[PDB]
Amino acid sequence: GPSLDFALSLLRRNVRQVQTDQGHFTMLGVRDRLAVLPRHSQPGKTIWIEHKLVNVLDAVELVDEQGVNLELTLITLDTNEKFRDITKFIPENISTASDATLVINTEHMPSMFVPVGDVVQYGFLNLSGKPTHRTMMYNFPTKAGQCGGVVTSVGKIIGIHIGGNGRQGFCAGLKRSYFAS
Ligand SMILES: *C(=O)[C@H](C[C@@H]1CCCNC1=O)NC(=O)[C@H](Cc1ccc(F)cc1)NC(=O)c1cc(C)on1
Numbered sequence: 113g114p115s116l117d118f119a120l121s122l123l124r125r126n127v128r129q130v131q132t133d134q135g136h137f138t139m140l141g142v143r144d145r146l147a148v149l150p151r152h153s154q155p156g157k158t159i160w161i162e163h164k165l166v167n168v169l170d171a172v173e174l175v176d177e178q179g180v181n182l183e184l185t186l187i188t189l190d191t192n193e194k195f196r197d198i199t200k201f202i203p204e205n206i207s208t209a210s211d212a213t214l215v216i217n218t219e220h221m222p223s224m225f226v227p228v229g230d231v232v233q234y235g236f237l238n239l240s241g242k243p244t245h246r247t248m249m250y251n252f253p254t255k256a257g258q259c260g261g262v263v264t265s266v267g268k269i270i271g272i273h274i275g276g277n278g279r280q281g282f283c284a285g286l287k288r289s290y291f292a293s
Contacts, residue, residue, distance in 0.1 A: 118201075118267045119215050119225060125196045127217045127262055131160040136218040137260035140272065141195030142186075142291050145169075150259045150274045150284065151183045159187070163219075166190060174290060176245050183244040183274050183284045186291070199291045201269045206246055206285035208232055209265035214254075214273055214281075216261040224261075228252040228281065231263060231270065237282055239275045246285040247274070254281025 130139040132153045139161065141147045149155055151173050158167055167190035174182040209231040216224040228250035237247040250263075254276035263271030263283050271283030 115211070115264070115266055116213065116225065119213055119264055122198065122262065122264065122269070123215055123217060123223055126198055127215055128161050129218050129222065130260065131163075131219070132156070136220055136257055138215070138217045138221075138258070138262065138273075139260055140262050140269075143197035143199055144194050145189045145191060146291065147187050147189060147195070148272060149185050149187060150272055151181060151185045152274070153185070153260065155185065155187055159189075161189075178245075180243055180245045182246055184272060184290070198269060199288050201267060202286050202288040202291065203268055203270065204288055206233070206248070206287050207268060207270050208248065209263070209268070209270055212250060212263055212265040212270070214250075214252075214258065214261045214263055216258050216273075218257060218260075220257055226252065226254075226258070226261070228254070228263070231265070231283065234282060237275070239282075244274070244282075244284070247282045248285055249280050249282050251279075252281050253279050
């Protein structure tokens, strides 16, 4: 219903099929020329968006006040395009949620809704030797190919998927101030 209406709106206008040397990811266009990707996709000076090559002008890998990885990287793309500003759908603080859907859009998983259920606070997560703070979990056997997916519930954007164990899956908590500047 109104929750997925929003997911469609976001798929169409802000969620992009992307590739880096690290493989396939879902990119969230945030506003203007600013997008986010999970840190592990390691975007270089360039990146493929719907297969066309786009320059990356600047790239920040977000960290704690304590310097811990938050597993997110803001990029500023080289285009004449504005993403419709969806920062007003990102809460001020990392928000847990109920019947969330994970929105994925890559070449292999195009236009994809995954019903991950509730999203609960997790916090510290060490995936493959690499710590992350401010993560949240949903109880769903998430997989390779879904990183960068956008976690939504009730018209809010709360998360970018970043990992899983074959049973649960984990996202990077989104908060609006990250998209400040
Ligand atoms: C997204 O690219 C991908 C998605 C995971 C893969 C594992 C199964 N479930 C999926 O949701 N993420 C990763 O593979 C993640 C990469 C990562 C994330 C954060 C970080 F700090 C460093 C690396 N790796 C894992 O989730 C993972 C799973 C096991 C087992 O070890 N590592």
